[PDB]
Amino acid sequence: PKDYDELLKYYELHETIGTGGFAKVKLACHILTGEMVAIKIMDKNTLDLPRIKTEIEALKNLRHQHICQLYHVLETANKIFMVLEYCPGGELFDYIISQDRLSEEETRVVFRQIVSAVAYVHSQGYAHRDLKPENLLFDEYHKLKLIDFGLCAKSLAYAAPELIQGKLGSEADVWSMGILLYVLMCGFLPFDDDNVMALYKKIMRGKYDVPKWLSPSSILLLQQMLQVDPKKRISMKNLLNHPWIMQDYNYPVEWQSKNPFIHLDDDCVTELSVHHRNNRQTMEDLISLWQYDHLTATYLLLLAKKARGKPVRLR
Numbered sequence: 099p100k101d102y103d104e105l106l107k108y109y110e111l112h113e114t115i116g117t118g119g120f121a122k123v124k125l126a127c128h129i130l131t132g133e134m135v136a137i138k139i140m141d142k143n144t145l146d147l148p149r150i151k152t153e154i155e156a157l158k159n160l161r162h163q164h165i166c167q168l169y170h171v172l173e174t175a176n177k178i179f180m181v182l183e184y185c186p187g188g189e190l191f192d193y194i195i196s197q198d199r200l201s202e203e204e205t206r207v208v209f210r211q212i213v214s215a216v217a218y219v220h221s222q223g224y225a226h227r228d229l230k231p232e233n234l235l236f237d238e239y240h241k242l243k244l245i246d247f248g249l250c251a252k253s254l255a256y257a258a259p260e261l262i263q264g265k266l267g268s269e270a271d272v273w274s275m276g277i278l279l280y281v282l283m284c285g286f287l288p289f290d291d292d293n294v295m296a297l298y299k300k301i302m303r304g305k306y307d308v309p310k311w312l313s314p315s316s317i318l319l320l321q322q323m324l325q326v327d328p329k330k331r332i333s334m335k336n337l338l339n340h341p342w343i344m345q346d347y348n349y350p351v352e353w354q355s356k357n358p359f360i361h362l363d364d365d366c367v368t369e370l371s372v373h374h375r376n377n378r379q380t381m382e383d384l385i386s387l388w389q390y391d392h393l394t395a396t397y398l399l400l401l402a403k404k405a406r407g408k409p410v411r412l413r
């Protein structure tokens with residue numbers, strides 16, 4: 099109750115919109131902007147504590163069009179709150195359930211965004227190591243956003259044989275994306291079993307069912323991504339411009355950030371200094387501290403307004 103006092107200053111909390119084992123996420127409204135945000139809540143006491151320093155510091159160093167944006171971090175005696183970009187389209191998994199499976203054309207659209215995000219994550223020196231439809235969300239634009247960076251440093255169905263054997267984090271994400279590709283185009287996992295060691299065994303053998311509806315080029319790509327030997331596996335580089343990926347596009351995956359923090363935004367800075375009745379130069383400095391506090395939150399949520407073609411205005 100007193101743990102939520104600091105948060106409730108800045109946000110109107112709505113329902114729990116989801117709950118994994120490690121954290122609960124609530125929908126909320128940022129009071130100063132009216133912007134919807136997802137707030138991941140973690141109990142420090144009943145927790146795996148390294149998992150959230152991993153995620154927060156990863157998110158501070160990752161700014162990308164298909165990575166879920168962090169805004170505000172609040173730590174209390176008993177809680178850690180992470181205010182994040184709200185993605186109303188929900189999990190990719192649920193879209194794959196409602197449609198039985200995606201067509202090759204629709205899969206490619208979706209998959210190029212995943213390859214974009216993961217390729218960027220690798221460019222910054224990280225490896226996600228937990229890639230699956232549950233960890234990809236559709237934003238308001240029906241564009242994908244990658245989430246849950248708790249295992250990415252410098253699921254077993256999606257885990258690569260080397261990663262389970264504990265021997266190469268970049269090649270393991272390629273494997274996981276192979277499983278993801280398969281799920282998108284088939285509607286089920288290529289390796290699956292109710293017994294965890296039997297699933298393990300299937301993964302090591304590398305043999306899977308190849309449904310009739312798949313094209314020969316899809317099957318080739320799956321065969322290249324799901325090599326048990328990571329040396330034989332296709333690298334991230336040649337994934338970006340693979341003939342299958344290029345189909346209907348004819349350019350490689352644009353993996354670079356289209357929203358890199360170059361300088362600041364003057365329209366956001368002015369509205370803050372105007373709304374708070376502060377010296378403009380002083381407002382430029384406190385934003386530039388980048389503490390991921392309520393001020394950082396307000397600035398970043400005003401960029402979000404600009405990014406969606408809306409006026410940068412507080413109330």
Ligand SMILES: COC(=O)c1ccc2c(c1)NC(=O)/C2=C(\Nc1ccc(N(C)C(=O)CN2CCN(C)CC2)cc1)c1ccccc1
Pocket residue numbers: 115116117118123125136138166182183184185186187188189235244245246247
């Ligand atoms: C690093 O990033 C993260 O760690 C992270 C993790 C999760 C989310 C996130 C960031 N950002 C989000 O938005 C997240 C979720 N968002 C969501 C969106 C839509 C739904 N769905 C499908 C609803 O139907 C909810 N819907 C109900 C009706 N009311 C009126 C509106 C809200 C459910 C969850 C979500 C959270 C928990 C688990 C799964 C996903």
Ligand SMILES: [Cl-]
Pocket residue numbers: 210211214350351352
């Ligand atoms: Cl692209």
